[PDB]
Write a protein that binds this ligand. Sequence first.
Ligand SMILES: C[C@](O)(COc1ccc(C#N)c2ccccc12)C(=O)Nc1ccc(C#N)c(C(F)(F)F)c1
Length: 238
Amino acid sequence: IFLNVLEAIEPGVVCAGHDNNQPDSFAALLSSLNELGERQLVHVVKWAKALPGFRNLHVDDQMAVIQYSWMGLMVFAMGWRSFTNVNSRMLYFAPDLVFNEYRMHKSRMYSQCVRMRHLSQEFGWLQITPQEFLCMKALLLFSIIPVDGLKNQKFFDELRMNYIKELDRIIACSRRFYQLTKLLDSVQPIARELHQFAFDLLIKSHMVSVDFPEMMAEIISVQVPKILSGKVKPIYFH
Ligand SMILES: C[C@](O)(COc1ccc(C#N)c2ccccc12)C(=O)Nc1ccc(C#N)c(C(F)(F)F)c1
């Protein structure tokens, strides 16, 4: 039942709308990454709200965790696509936005991309199944909260616990749980580097010819700083 649900609500492919007939440029690549992220958010919200038990959370907490977890969710999903689609040879951000090393360098996000490629390879090395991927991704939505707590911390704690239990079941074991939790923890530092990058870019957006979509600009200026300043922190297993 649980896996049936995750499979059913998994979003289809989301395209960036990038012009691949134009020579690569920092401005063009970043405008496309921004647009892609904005398009993806729309689906992340619909996805999250259709997750088992998600509606139990206080309305404010729902929006909050989606926004805090947004980067991590996409890093994880992107690494999986890269693994399944091109065996981690390139970063599959979208069917029309595939990054080779040249693009990684021109985007000025090289270090972050390399780390995501390593994550992509991990899916292969650990032979992560599509079902483990789905459950781990759902768990990622419940892996970052305010140090001060949510409006209804109890409901969140209950939900996170239940999702960990579903991962347990899909595994059923100790060694596997160790690997998977270690993998999940690895997503956080990567999302952090991207959060920092996004924040720095927004602040200087008017000087690099980059354009930021409405929702993304709000989240980067309201939510991301809470993460970078340590007011909102990921939940690590280890
Ligand atoms: C530079 C930027 O356009 C900034 O975009 C974001 C800024 C702040 C976020 C927050 N909070 C945020 C959360 C989620 C996605 C993007 C976000 C970018 O990184 N885009 C990007 C687009 C698609 C995927 C994918 N898949 C990824 C990937 F996750 F890194 F892989 C990255």
